[PDB]
Structures are given as structure tokens and as C-alpha cells.
Symmetry: D3
Subunit: 226 residues, 6 copies
């Protein structure tokens, strides 16, 4: 690997991936004896223990191309189970800020990265691992956290204008919008990794936040070590 | 409707859909007082009771265009919950004939029917209802039936040649191939219906037996539909 | 064959295909000594004689994927000449219910089945056999039937909405809409089969009907056996 | 019109179009009292009489974009019936040099010009006028000419390489390759013009020629004026 | 070649290409001892000298398919440097009729000719040779001619309707529209030829005069080609 | 802006953008009185003076989606001139490590981000600003640095396999491969910003490095303030 410079044995098989390096550092506090194993290119990676298991928390930056690079290199270092923990904008009225969304699939526009990996324009089912996702639901339910289960649209252009945005994507079965779930799910299916995702609603297109991010992180870490 | 000619209220809200009219007839014997509510164009639809609950068993033919028409017309007659029960060809070697596959998503080639409904070529997530699919897993487990959970490729050309077929679709996360799950899942997401699918493995690309497998799984699906 | 379980020798080289099993059974009364050679999966197939030749009438269901399977299996049993006889909705105001349309070509949205068979998105000319089609015109003339010759749009989504449907397809040279001739024509040109199509107008998007179907069926049978 | 500077009244309703200015000049000798009504940009157009009717012979250059412009301008001047007469390379072994191909449809790769005119990638049936085409068959028969009826592939890249060229297009129902009938047919169906095409085989990818061109030209003129 | 029927060595390595045969003839009078090296199919090609250097002026007709054939055949006859000199319609209001546009790149709709040459739908950068384009800017500046530098949209359908034409292409970084730059640039990149383009503005979508503009710019192009 | 939290007046009109936060910090040393104006999400942005002008050095992360976000927000804060300074893998034999490439255009696979911004699949010319790029050449020439001018392929999948990679892209006129030039150029053309790019060759697919990066940075800063 040329972006994540951690040595083999420094990355755990179980990894919690976040887009914001700042969140990676903040969540490392939930691990026992956390150690920084990479800082190159801003991709902070911490490794420690939790619930009798070794786990790593890694930064993936923003966008499909960026997360694909991080997942590929972490895998080269031993990782094989990834749970995405990010933020999202809800596309439906009833979901409130600070609540969570457990992702069941990802809609996306074809092209670029997908074409290079799949070699044609087939719409391959972009879904998380069945069992891992159910473990997430169980964990969030045990911690009495309010969540919704559903598909999300993985956008590549956060600023491209679309006057029909909310109605378009929500009418297509998506309850939220984010940017890297489709890449995570599809690449994992091709590579044989087990992946899932949970998002914190930080906006609704249709301190309390710190509490939300922290609460959800504990639930994800429980899932990763169960 | 112009294809399904059922009379007012003859169709249940929950429907078990199959591609073979012969299977619809056969499975209708699992229902209490089954009645033939439609026979037009060969699309046999029966309605009766299972565990005290009213349900229908409907024929959808072969292919996306056919199942789309049947789902649209059943919905106009009052249906809003659909569980497809079909046959499939496995794409991986560890799955045996007669076992079952509970579908979690569907891969497909874009264009045609999807372009007309979606209005562009976006790859909209073609997935079943989460809750309903989990209920199916529970039902099959309770009846000690051997199943696998995974995605399938919904093909439009049964006889089209592809020398790299198995490796291509299996390397893409699909464990089996059939022809209408992608249409079922996507149209349901768009129209607001709750759908799911269970398939009986009849071939592995990697009669008494088949009928027994079909009958055993049908009970598990019906349990789910009336739960 | 997996869906049509007729024994080889029971399917004629000349086949009249219809989408409705009910029409197959009704039209079988026009043959001499008809025998049901298949009913599996609802695909009724009858074989008998008409003006000195053996002919089969087969059901193809609805949609490209369905007719493709039926055609491939009938061919594996010995069929090589197909004439589709179905229903259609006119796209132009001057065509009346009960009249006929002899098809000269089919417009279609590419993808799916065409991509699997052609291996790319080329717009292969989807046309019927020239000779067979002219014989159809001659047969319908001889019987004094009212027909029109033109292209049709083979739709894959009967219920999908399009606010400009009639204007769009009629301005693209199509005079009616149906669902399987694009598949019939293209697959035939690829496999080397001789095919054609006649449609009965049952709607105009822009007793008598029973007689319309029967009258045109006789014209089609004369052609198949000419 | 911007490219064809003929004055209105100088272009006939019936037009024989050829790609080579030189063939336009040569074939003008078959008309009575021919007059050059345009030479701008090399697009020679001649107008005269033949068996009681006024007819024009026009040059269309090479390629879809070129013929599209010429057709649009000839139409703005009063033309509404077009018959292309060009050269082609056979894709099947039994067709010999000097023989003719009466075109029934055109296969093409979508995009560019078709996207600009149709507004999306729909595979609109690219076929000639049914009546006009049958009249061509009759005319060529009467003159005892050797012809074949079939589809052709309208290529946009004469020199692009394709190791499977002949096998691919011949297996797709095409018996010859040319460059502008897909444009001719589709644009005609959209604009409401009546069009057809006959080609002289000058190569087989799978004195005498001068006479072949002249013989078929007479057949085409009889059709245009029938 | 089967379209350009020139005899051995009658075509120069450097060629000024134009779409109008009439312009080729007219500009040939700027050359020392001009000779007509081809007239087949109307594609007039002349060869002569300019500033002691041998050069050719060739006709390419209209559209990508036509210019591709002509460029391929000229290259088979020894040409490897091409500068297109055509006419264009401006897409922005500040450019006046008779002024010039030195092209830096070409926008285009995919498919057809590009698919056959590139073998897929990748958007390969359709740009001219950097060095040659800079030489054109210098040449035009030396002759005090009014020019603008920018990208153009290479259209395949002159008469196809588009109610949002000007705003669409101008908002996409294009300052003018014509029909064969995309083909010229892309084919040249693939075949190893050095190409560039200069256009005379004959219309703004936002005879004596035109001929003068055409003549003045032709000298600047010829200076560049023989530099 | 929600990713780059710098206040208006804290970002200069002229910006040098790099993918690696580490390079942003290292190059800030070349500015007079540099100040850190943003660190949120790891997107380090420094602002200072150079050659009598105010300039900013900003981090854009990896990939089209990531750089699009950074450019959009910097623009919202006043930036309008951007020069990309990154690393690349050469696709041609003759270019050596440590040397530079001044980009004249970017090839790319359509889809995702481009579709969302352009609203269809047109291949819009992805080129840098003419004048700015020439200023770069002048600046690199004045500092006696070895550079090559040419197009690059902007890949979205750094790890997707392609056995024909080098020959494919180099035969298409690209001399190097990177990941965000196409997004930079195209978005700038749409938004009206002036952009350019120079890359340091760090690999050839067909301390000394520190020196190369530093030398090139001075040349880019000269260009930005000229």
C-alpha cells in the first residue's frame, strides 16, 4: 500500500470506518489502549481492543474513489470486516436529526469507478452483508436507540443541482443520501469482505449531535466484536 | 385490468406469486376453501384461507414484462404484499438441488422496462422488504429447511450465450439466477408494495424430489404471509 | 426444451404464435384433426393440418423474455417459420378497432435481452422476413381485409407512465404499440428463422372483435401454408 | 438552405441521391434536358425529365452528417421522395461484384446524430418506405437485373479496425455494409419523407462496373417516375 | 486509398484541410506553382509551395465520417500534420462575424465513429497538438488579426432541434459550434498525427467580408504550417 | 460550506491545491507569514503571501467527489483560480521519476459525478485554462525544470485491474494517470474558474523526490502570482 503506511499486524480484521479523521480520533477513545497506526495523507487509523477483541478505527475521506483506496489497502493489511459509520441527509419527513439509519442497499448512477471494477454497465446488487446488518439492528435495539432500516442513494456530486432531488430519490425507495455506501457494498461483494453501514442523520432535505455520534459508535463497536 | 379479469374483492391483500400456472393450482390445495378467481390469459389466481387468514396464489408467467403487468393489475384489485416463490439455477457449488434461496437483492442489466419506469439509467437498489425477508428466514428455520441467503441475477435471456456466465455473476455476489426478482423488487419500491422472494434450486450451473421441495417451502411462505 | 415439453416430431416447421393461450385453443378449431402437443406452464401448443400442410399454433405469453424462450424451444423441436398474430393499440387516429396492421419493423428501447443476445448496444435492424411479409399482404388482400403496413414500438412496460407517449412514438414512424415483435424479429435474424407479424387493433391511444380475430387467422394460415 | 444554393422551383419532388458528384454528373445524361441547379460545396444537383416526370439527381457526400444536411435542404426546396443509389461491400460470399442489393433496413451504432434527432438512445426502426421498396423490386425484375433483398450495416468509420467485422454484422442479419442509409431511413420516418435504397456491390469483404451502375440507374429512375 | 486517387508523392507532409472544395481551389492561388493532385469524389487536393516550403490544401467535406476517411487516406499518402481551417457559429455574444477562433479542444456526443475507433465509450480528451496551436496564436497575433481561444462543440446534426442549444453548450465551456474538430483531434491522437484548427466566424447563434476574412487567416495558417 | 470551515476573507482568490495534507503543510513554508485557516475533516488550508500577492494552499483529498466538494466550497469563499499540484504515474517509457507533466487535457470514463453535473452523457472537453497553462510552461522553463506537456487519464479506481491499461490509455494520447484532473477542468469550465495542473512523476507504469516537489512548487507559486 502507498497511502496507508501501517505495517501488517497493525490493522485488525474488524474495522470501523469513518469519513472524518476528527471522528476517528474522537472514537478511538472508546477503545482500550488505542494506538495510532497510520497518519499518512491524513488517513488516521487507530487500533486497540474492545469486548475482548482487537479492532481498528479508520478514516476513509470523502467519495467512492477515496474509500475504495482505503478499503483495498486495509484489506491488503488483513482487514476483512468493515462497518461504515457516517453522516447523512434524510430524504423523508418523519426522520429526525440525531436518529440513525441502518442501510439495506445503495442506489447509484453508473459509470466511473463501477465500470472500471465491473467491466461493463450491469447494475450489480449493492447490498451489505445480511447477517452483519441484522447484528447491527440487534445492537441498536439493545441500546434503545431510534433507527430506521432502508436504502440510501450514494451521490458522487455534493453540490450538483437537481430541482427534483428529494422526490426523485425518495420515490425510488431511498430514505437518505450519502456518498460511499454503493462503493463499499459493491466492492465488498466482489472482494469477499463482510460489510455494513449505519448513519447519523445530520440534516433532513425534506452537543446533542455529539451524544448521537457517541451512542451509535458504542452500538457499532458491540456489533463488530459480537 | 385487461389481463387479470377478477371480480371486485376476489383478490387478497397478501399474495404468493408463482410463474407456473400448474404450481398455482397445485399449491391452492394447501388453502382451506380455494376458489378460482381468474383464468384469463392463463394467469390462474386462486383465493382461500390459510391459518384463518385470507390469501391469494397468483400466476405471473415468465420474464419482467409479464410479472410487471400481473403485479400492477393485482395491486389495482387490492393486493399490496407479494412473495414470489419460484425456481432457480445455483451459481455456486455448495448449494444442492432441492434446497432454498431466500433473496436479499437482485442484479440486472439496465434498459427496457427499467428505463421506462425509472426514466433514466440509474442503478436503483433492487431489494425486497427487510422485515418480510427476515420473517421468511425465521419461518424456514422453524420448519428445519435448508436455505441460503443471498443476491441473484435476474436474466432476461434464458438461452443467450455467455462463456463466462458462472464466474461473472458469481464473482459479482450472486448465488443464483432467475428472471423476475429485479422487476419485482424495483417496481415494488416505486409503487409502495412490500415484497420478498424464495426460490427452490432446480439446477446448479457450477420430479418427486422437486414437488416435495416445492410443497415443503410453500408452507413456510404461507406461514410468513399469514403471520 | 425446459418449458415446452412437446415430443420432437409433434411441432411443425410452420408455426402461428399467439400470446393468449385462449386464442391458441380457439384458433385450433381452424385446423384439421388438431392435437394438443403441450400444455406445460400454460403454453398451449396445437398441431394439425391446413390446406395440405402441417402447422402448429403456439402460445408465447407476454413480453420479450417469454417469447424468446418459446421461440428457442420451438426451434429446438423443428420450427423455423414463425408468424405472430396478436393484439395492439393504434398510435394514429385513422386506424379503427378490428382492422389489421402488417408489421414492417419494430422500434425498441435497448438493454436487457438485446444486450445479452447481441453483446453490446448496437441498434440491429429489427425487421421481419421480406418475402413472408409480402405474402401476408397478398393473403389479407385476397380475403378483402382492411389493413395497414407500418412499424410498431415494442414496449417492455405496459403500465409505465409517459406524458408524451403517443406523440413520441408516432413521430418516430410507428403506427401501433405492442410488446414482442422486436424480440421476434431480432432473434429470428440472428438464428436464421423466417418471421413476420400481423396485429388486430383492439385499442386506439390516439362479436365484431371475435370475427376480426377469426378472419385474420384464416389469412395468416393461408400465408403459412402458401 | 445554406449548402445547397438551388433556387426553389429548381428541385423536383422526386430525387435520386448519390454520394459521388461524379456519378451525379454521369447519370444526368439519362435525363431529358438536364440543367445543373447547384454546385456549391461540390454538391452537384441536376434537374430534368424522365418518362413524363420531373426528377432531380443530387450528390450527398459521404457519411450520415453530410447526407442529413443535404436531405434537410432538398426538402426545404420541395423534395419529399428520395432513393439512394450507392456502392457497397458484401458481407456474404454468394453475392458477386456488379450485382445489386435492395435495402430493407439498416443496423447502426447509436449516438451522435441519432441522439441529437431522437433525443435519447431508443432504437427506432430504421426502415425504408414499404411501397417504394416493392416498386424497386418490380423495376429491377422487369429489367432482368440480379439483386438481393436484405438489411445493411451503416458504418460511421470506414477505416476503424474490427477483427470480427464480417462475422459480427453478417450474423446480425446484414448482407452488406454502407454508410448512410440508417440516417436516410430514420430521418425520413421522422420528417415524413418517402425513401428507399439500392446499392451496387463493388467489393466483397467475405467496363462491367460502369455498365452495372448505368443499368441500375435506369431501374431506379423508372421507379421514381412510376 | 479508394476515395483520394493521388499519385505517389503528390501529397505533402503538411496539409491545410477545408470542408469546401471551392475554398481549396480559391486558397490554392496563395501557393507558388499549385497543381491539382486529386479531384475524385469532389475531394479537391492541391500541392504547391509557400515560403519555399511544400504544402497541400485538401477538401474534407462535411461531418466526422467524411473527414475521418480523408485524413486516413492523406496519411497513407504521406501526410502527418493537419490544420483544419473552417467556418463556425459563435455561441457567445462578444464574438463578431469575421473574427477567428483558435480551437483548444472539442466537446462531442459519444457513439458511432468514436465507438468504432475507441472500442468503448470513454471520453478520450479531444485536443489539438499543444505546440502547433501555440504557433497559430503567434502567427495570428503577428498579422494583427482578431481571434479568441477556446473549445467548440462538434455537432453531427446541423438541423436537429434543441431549444436549449446555446445555453447548454456555452455553459459547458464552448464558444462556438462546428462539425469535425472532435473527429480530427481524437483520430489524430490515436494515429499519431499533429493537428490543430482555426475557424472563421460566419454566424453568431447568441460575401466580400467573408472572403476577405478567409483570405487573411489563410496566410496566417500557411505561415504556421511552413514554420 | 460544511466541510471547509474557513471564514470569508480567509481564503485567497489564487489557490494551489494538493491532495496530501502533508504536502499542504510542507509547502506552506514557501509562503510569507502563513496561517492555518482550516483543519476540519483533515482539509488543511494555509493562507499567506508570495511575490506581492495573497495565496492559499489547500488540501483536496483523493478522487473526483472529494476535489469537487473542496473546489465548490473554496469558491463560495472567494477562490476563482486553481492550480492542481499532484503526483502521477507515467504511461510512456521516456519520462523519468522526479520530472514534471504540464496537463493539457484529461480523458475519463463517463458516469457518476459528470452525469450529475452535466445532466447527460456528453463528452464535454475537459481542458485547463489556455493562458494559465502557458504561464506554467513559461515558469517551469525559467527555473530550468524538465517537463512534458500532454493529456492524462483521470482514473476513479486505483486498484481496479486492467491487463491492457498502459497500452490502452497511452494509445489514446495520455502520457500519465492521476485521479482528479477531469473533475477539476470540467467543473471549472462550467463554473467559470481558471484552472491548470502540473504533476510530479512518482512512478512509471511503462530525498530526490522532496527536491522535485519543492522545486515544482516554487514554479507553480510564481505562476499563480504572475
Amino acid at each position: 500500500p502507498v497511502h496507508i503506511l501501517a505495517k501488517k499486524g497493525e490493522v485488525a480484521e474488524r474495522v470501523l470506518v469513518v469519513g472524518d479523521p476528527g471522528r476517528a480520533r474522537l472514537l478511538s477513545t472508546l477503545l482500550q489502549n488505542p494506538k495510532l497506526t497510520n497518519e499518512n495523507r491524513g488517513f488516521l487509523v487507530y487500533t486497540g481492543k474492545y469486548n475482548g477483541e482487537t479492532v481498528s478505527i479508520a478514516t476513509h475521506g470523502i467519495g467512492g474513489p477515496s474509500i475504495a483506496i482505503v478499503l483495498e489497502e486495509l484489506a491488503m493489511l488483513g482487514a476483512n470486516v468493515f462497518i461504515r459509520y457516517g453522516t447523512t441527509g434524510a430524504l423523508v419527513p418523519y426522520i429526525n436529526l440525531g436518529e440513525y439509519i441502518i442501510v439495506t442497499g445503495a442506489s447509484y448512477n453508473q459509470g466511473g469507478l463501477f465500470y472500471q471494477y465491473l467491466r461493463d454497465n450491469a447494475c450489480v446488487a449493492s447490498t451489505p452483508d445480511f447477517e452483519l446488518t441484522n447484528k447491527l439492528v440487534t445492537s441498536f435495539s439493545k441500546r434503545n436507540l431510534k433507527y430506521y432500516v432502508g436504502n440510501v442513494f450514494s451521490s458522487d456530486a455534493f453540490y450538483a443541482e437537481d430541482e427534483e432531488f428529494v422526490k426523485k430519490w425518495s420515490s425510488r425507495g431511498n430514505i437518505a443520501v450519502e456518498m460511499e455506501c454503493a462503493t463499499l457494498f459493491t466492492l465488498s461483494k466482489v472482494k469477499g469482505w463482510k460489510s455494513a453501514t449505519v448513519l447519523v442523520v445530520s440534516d433532513n432535505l425534506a452537543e446533542e449531535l455529539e451524544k448521537s455520534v457517541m451512542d451509535g459508535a458504542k452500538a457499532v463497536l458491540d456489533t463488530l466484536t459480537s
